[PDB]
């Protein structure tokens, strides 16, 4: 329960389960599976 | 001015990262309105919202 | 969640642990893949790896040092610390600054704790219930000249009013014009061969002015006000490599002439453990 | 079912790049560039979108890969301004936006050895030599085609060119964090980047405010077999794409 | 709440710039009167200017 | 329902020009200008469109009006060919294609007298002042935003002034088969043409070849009041519209 | 929830989302309309 109005007061969000570490580690245009050759 | 007077003006809005017009040429390349002096006394030349950033500080 | 998959022996063609890292990308090679593993959890969520977490809890993040005392004679008080001011910035502590410059945008509602005490080297024979006014400063609002200045009404400038000892708890919501902090600005303010470069309208959130409203006692009371910060609604884009060397200066990542090694040299040949 | 993932072909406009010893082309944090939407804008007036004029591939000057060359760094879209019509666009308006589409060349045999380090640093803030609160002077971080070579002498106002520390304070290992690519001799010849717009604001300027930077760092050294030439062409070219101009004004007006 | 409308090339009879203040009264002018705008959006209540707040 | 014919108002680009004494827009052969379509293309390279950035409103230096003055030519795209980001578009392609939106300008009292024929003749190839088989010189028929003033004196290669032989062996009563309108300063003071692309090919040179130009031929001597300036000025402001190039290409390399 | 029966004590009522910037800008007798002739 909130005691204040304006979202300045409310508080944190706790976690964002919503992962997604491909942006970071695969950020390739061509799809790269695990095993097949990364270049043919 | 009198009612039997005509002239015609150039108000120019210069965005920002430029100098200020030093001279017509140089003004009318951005946004400008031209002012035909006449029956109607008032122009209303409204000074687009042009920036990058959402807000710009007062001072 | 499954942590490791079982697996026996593999002999096919598929190589799971040869790949080519000219493509940029880091294969997501499971211990599954070299050797037989077992069938284990995570146990595990990784709440405190969030950067919620990570970049949200309350630090000092400036500091500073006045007095309240009789001020007669005094023509210049601010610059005599009759009351100082502090340009907001998150980039003057060091072991916040890097985790926040971890980041190249960064966007969050601020938590301020305001930490003065009282104290009295000099012959004082008690120490005062002092009153401090604590006041943000917007740019534009009036940077008071004098303890007692025309601005301290506070009429648009918010004031919090509390005693020496305990903290106000006040929360700022994201006042950048941007959709983040640029916590790092390749570029200027302006086209100018004389500008400075990188501290620019991102950079200046104002600046917070400290002083006391209660009139002097007998004696000189040198407060030292430390501040505290904690970050909320923490969020943050593009990645960047960990601060290495140190810093001189607040927005600026320039560092010093002949700064020390960072890399921790081997103790022999590259052959030893 | 018969094809090859180093192949590639790049058309834009009028421009086509060809290459056979490609690696994947790498899509900086999976966002291809898109135009900026209506539920962004802060500025009122329209955008002007030269699609085909100024989105082509403009090859820079190539650059001489010596055995003790540091590396480069050019600055986007300052090493395209002063291209063509792109570099009047980008002049003749206070704002800019637009992506770009990174392609390094550098090729030679089956006998050099090598590797080069062609990554993206988005807000890429130089440090200055003086170190203290020195500043870095607008002239330098904006050279144009010229790029900042990492191996010369320092002037009053241009920053730092160590490359250890990415002229910013930061590691050499550690720029892996940001999309790049290396183009390894043996493997690889030409990378690929394809970089959208990166900013905190929907629309900035793009005379005084540099995006992304590029960065080519040779990181393992250039062994030329016995009795050749210790020197490889490196060749960058760079097409912008999605690009938006809002206020056609009074030309900018630069220094010099 | 939409800021500026999508607007393009106006030649037409009606101006909506040109206006008499004699008659006192503020024509709500938009920049879509004077120029080619496009389809942007307010993103912007206006509550710390109430006099409420203010 | 209430309104008026002389009060009008176009809107390009950022560029907005009011008028209330003016008269009809005439629009040239009832013809608005358009995109080339496809079915008449012959070239095969895209064409790029700066719509927004291109078709304003360009204010022309304004002329004096006295009354010894034979009148005025503009050659377009000729006129436009020095005017921000056009001029670039125009000279780093080898073609291109735009209509225009011609607007004359000249305010005086209820007092004063005279009439400006403002006319639009497509493909006004000017006679030289040599006679014989002597040709007109590419550096006087392309002025620039300087135009062609009929009252001064001939230079080697610049066409001949004759205003009455409309520079080409053609009276002046007979221009009024082309597109005009007059400048009565008694019922008009600002004239409107809207031009569209006028040539025999889809797509021809727009630096070689200019498609119209712009003449404004006083007719009436201008007969100002006792104790006024006998002068008045006349400023002519032109609009792309529809524009395309095709080809982005080296600069093109004019004289000078 | 309010600690106290008097509205002396209540807390602000927010902001008043009503808006009506046409008693001070257009406060003419006739109706104006944006673009036709102020005067005729």
């Given amino acids: 329960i909130n005691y204040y109005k304006d979202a300045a007061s409310t508080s944190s969000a706790g976690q964002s389960?919503?992962?997604?570490?491909?942006?970071?580690?695969?950020?390739?245009?061509d799809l790269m599976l695990k095993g097949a050759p990364a270049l043919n | 001015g009198p009612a039997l007077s005509s002239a015609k003006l150039i108000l120019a809005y210069t965005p920002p990262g430029a100098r200020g017009?030093?001279?017509?040429?140089?003004?009318?390349?951005?946004?400008?309105?031209?002012?035909?002096?006449?029956?109607?006394?008032?122009?209303?030349?409204?000074?687009?919202?042009?920036?990058?950033?959402?807000?710009?500080?007062t001072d | 969640?499954?942590?490791?998959?079982?697996?026996?022996?593999?002999?096919?063609?598929?190589?799971?642990?040869?790949?080519?890292?000219?493509?940029?990308?880091?294969?997501?090679?499971?211990?599954?893949?070299?050797?037989?593993?077992?069938?284990?959890?995570?146990?595990?969520?990784?709440?405190?790896?969030?950067?919620?977490?990570?970049?949200?809890?309350?630090?000092?993040?400036?500091?500073?040092?006045?007095?309240?005392?009789?001020?007669?004679?005094?023509?210049?008080?601010?610059?005599?610390?009759?009351?100082?001011?502090?340009?907001?910035?998150?980039?003057?502590?060091?072991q916040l600054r890097k985790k926040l410059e971890l980041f190249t945008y960064v966007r969050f509602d601020s938590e301020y704790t305001i930490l003065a005490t009282a104290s009295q080297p000099d012959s004082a024979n008690y120490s005062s219930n002092l009153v401090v006014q604590a006041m943000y400063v917007p740019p534009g609002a009036p940077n008071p000249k004098e303890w007692?200045?025309?601005?301290?009404?506070?009429?648009?400038?918010?004031?919090?009013?509390?005693?020496?000892?305990?903290?106000?708890?006040?929360?700022?919501?994201?006042?950048?014009?941007?959709?983040?902090?640029?916590?790092?600005?390749?570029?200027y303010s302006h086209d100018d061969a004389e500008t400075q470069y990188g501290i620019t309208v991102l950079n200046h959130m104002g600046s917070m002015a400290f002083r006391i409203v209660n009139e002097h006692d007998e004696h000189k009371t040198l407060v030292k006000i430390r501040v505290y910060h904690r970050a909320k609604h923490v969020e943050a884009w593009i990645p960047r490599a960990p601060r290495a060397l140190p810093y001189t200066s607040i927005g600026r990542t320039n560092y010093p002439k002949n700064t020390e090694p960072v890399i921790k040299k081997r103790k022999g040949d590259i052959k030893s453990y | 079912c018969g094809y090859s993932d180093r192949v590639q072909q790049i058309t834009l406009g009028n421009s086509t790049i060809t290459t056979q010893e490609a690696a994947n082309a790498v899509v900086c944090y999976a966002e291809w560039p898109e135009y900026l939407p209506d539920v962004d804008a802060s500025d009122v007036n329209k955008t002007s979108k030269p699609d085909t004029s100024v989105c082509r591939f403009y090859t820079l000057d190539s650059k001489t890969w010596t055995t003790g060359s540091k590396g480069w760094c050019w600055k986007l879209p300052d090493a395209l301004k002063d291209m063509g019509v792109f570099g009047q666009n980008m002049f003749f308006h206070s704002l800019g936006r637009s992506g770009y589409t990174v392609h390094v060349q550098c090729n030679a045999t089956k006998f050099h050895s090598g590797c080069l380090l062609v990554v993206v640093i988005p807000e890429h803030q130089l440090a200055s030599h003086e170190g203290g609160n020195v500043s870095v002077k607008y002239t330098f971080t904006h050279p144009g085609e010229r790029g900042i070579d990492l191996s010369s002498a320092n002037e009053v106002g241009g920053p730092?060119?160590?490359?250890?520390?990415?002229?910013?304070?930061?590691?050499?290992?550690?720029?892996?964090?940001f999309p790049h690519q290396f183009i390894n001799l043996r493997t690889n010849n030409t990378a690929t980047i394809v970089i959208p717009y990166i900013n905190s604001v929907p629309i900035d300027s793009m005379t005084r405010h540099?995006?992304?930077?590029?960065?080519?760092?040779?990181?393992?050294?250039?062994?030329?077999?016995?009795?050749?030439?210790?020197?490889?062409?490196?060749?960058?070219?760079i097409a912008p794409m999605c690009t938006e101009?809002?206020?056609?004004?009074?030309?900018?007006?630069?220094?010099?």
């Fill in chain 4, 160 to 177: 730092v060119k160590d490359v250890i520390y990415n002229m910013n304070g930061t590691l050499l290992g550690n720029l892996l964090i």
């Fill in chain 3, 1 to 94: 969640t499954v942590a490791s998959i079982s697996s026996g022996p593999k002999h096919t063609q598929k190589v799971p642990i040869l790949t080519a890292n000219e493509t940029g990308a880091t294969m997501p090679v499971l211990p599954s893949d070299s050797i037989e593993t077992r069938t284990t959890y995570m146990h595990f969520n990784g709440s405190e790896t969030d950067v919620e977490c990570f970049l949200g809890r309350a630090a000092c993040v400036h500091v500073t040092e006045i007095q309240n005392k009789d001020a007669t004679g005094i023509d210049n008080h601010r610059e005599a610390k009759l009351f100082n001011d502090w340009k907001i910035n998150l980039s003057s502590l060091v």
């Fill in chain 4, 210 to 237: 540099n995006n992304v930077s590029l960065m080519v760092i040779p990181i393992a050294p250039l062994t030329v077999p016995t009795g050749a030439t210790p020197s490889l062409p490196i060749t960058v070219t």
């Fill in chain 2, 21 to 57: 017009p030093q001279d017509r040429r140089e003004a009318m390349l951005g946004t400008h309105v031209v002012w035909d002096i006449g029956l109607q006394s008032t122009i209303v030349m409204t000074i687009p919202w042009t920036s990058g950033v959402q807000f710009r500080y």
């Fill in chain 1, 17 to 29: 389960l919503s992962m997604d570490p491909s942006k970071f580690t695969e950020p390739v245009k």
């Fill in chain 4, 245 to 256: 101009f809002s206020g056609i004004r009074s030309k900018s007006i630069v220094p010099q």
């Fill in chain 3, 148 to 187: 007692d200045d025309y601005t301290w009404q506070s009429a648009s400038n918010p004031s919090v009013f509390f005693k020496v000892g305990d903290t106000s708890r006040f929360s700022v919501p994201y006042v950048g014009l941007a959709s983040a902090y640029n916590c790092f600005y390749d570029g």
